[PDB]
Write a protein that binds this DNA or RNA. Structure first.
Length: 141
RNA sequence: CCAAGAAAAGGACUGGAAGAAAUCAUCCAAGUUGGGGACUAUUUUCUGCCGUAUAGGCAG
DNA sequence: AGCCACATCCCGGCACTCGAAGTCCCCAACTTGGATGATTTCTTCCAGTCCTGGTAA
DNA sequence: TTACCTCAGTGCCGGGATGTGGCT
């Protein structure tokens, strides 16, 4: 789900990790420069979790472990939880489709859900026509 | 276990000078707001003595 | 046909009403005629510097 | 070291009881 999307201009400067000469030189050079594109995100995820064992562990302990397991890296950038001074339960679990869907219907109108497409495209010209006709269609990797 | 893993763009700076928006002008004519009506009830405030006294002070 | 488990079912029981005036009805809402001319819209000079290749002679 | 190369209602609540359906 996409709530915020901001494009950032410019490009990163590399660390001076390369000596100017291998020996008898006290000068440091810059490896080289690349031209990329970066952005800041705000997003929610809904993961379908399954436990093979007949007896499950729906406990506070597991909610702590779900907070610990969360990676710090995402899409090459840095991932953070919501700020501490305004913290609420950002890591809830549902075992009912009716309760979960009801809560999701309340999301702000200016955000986007991203769904899989049906169309089969074999060229950029076919993509050009599909994009001219729809307004909801986007190419992705 | 993410076109994966690591990363300091920094240092300095004078926009200035000068100016005439002006002349003219007719909003008018007519007009029916009207007819009817309960603030008191299950109220609480009585009965006396002193004092010239509808003044002022008192017991029950 | 006889025996046992599990469904509900109806009477006795229990708890609530709850303070505490009323505030006007109905029908109509304007026609006509015109919106100005003549003139002009700036000129001088300037527009940084340095670092951040791979490959083979 | 260097050179190269791009656009009168109602709502729970207890408790004993009436009655029933399946197995032997």
């Amino acid at each position: 789900y996409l709530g915020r999307y901001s494009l950032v201009t410019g490009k990163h400067l590399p660390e001076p990790s390369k000596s100017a000469d291998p020996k008898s030189v006290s000068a440091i050079r810059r490896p080289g420069l690349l031209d990329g594109r970066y952005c800041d995100l705000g997003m929610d995820l809904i993961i379908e979790v399954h436990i093979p064992t007949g007896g499950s562990l729906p406990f506070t302990t597991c909610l702590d472990l779900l907070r610990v397991a969360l990676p710090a890296r995402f899409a090459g950038g840095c991932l953070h939880p919501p700020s501490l001074y305004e913290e609420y339960n950002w890591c809830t679990v549902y075992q009912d489709k009716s309760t979960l869907f009801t809560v999701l219907s309340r999301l702000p109108r200016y955000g986007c859900w991203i769904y899989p497409s049906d169309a089969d495209l074999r060229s950029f010209e076919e993509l050009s026509e599909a994009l001219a006709l729809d307004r909801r269609l986007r190419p992705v990797a």
